[PDB]
Amino acid sequence: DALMVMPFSYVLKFLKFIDTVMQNKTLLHSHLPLICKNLFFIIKFNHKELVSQKNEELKLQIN
Amino acid sequence: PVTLAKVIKVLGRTGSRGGVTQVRVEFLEDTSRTIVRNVKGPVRENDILVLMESEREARRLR
């Protein structure tokens, strides 16, 4: 319920945070299940708006 | 000019003031775009709200 309340603009912010976590391998494996659950829920909830965006920088982050 | 937005989700556990409901609405003009708004009357999904302003983002009203 906490994740649904965030507007979309903060979802891009959230997706930048997770990208930053990925470089720090110690944090990634420390909380890997938690990171997965939040990320997948975010993508599913507002998938329609995410795919609509044409930001090239966004496409590289998800990759 | 005033925009029209259809409610797609009635958020819960938002901590809003009594009688005020926080909802998520997608613009009819641009279905992809979404915005979180505050509504005063009884609101359900698939009903359309007339937004006078489309830039303000909803905040919790306590």
Binding site: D1, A2, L3, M4, V5, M6, Y10 | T14, G15, R60
Partner: peptide
């Protein structure tokens, strides 16, 4: 006080 989700947005 701030609620879950509201705190996360601040963070």
């Amino acid at each position: 006080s701030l609620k879950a989700g509201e705190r996360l947005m601040e963070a």
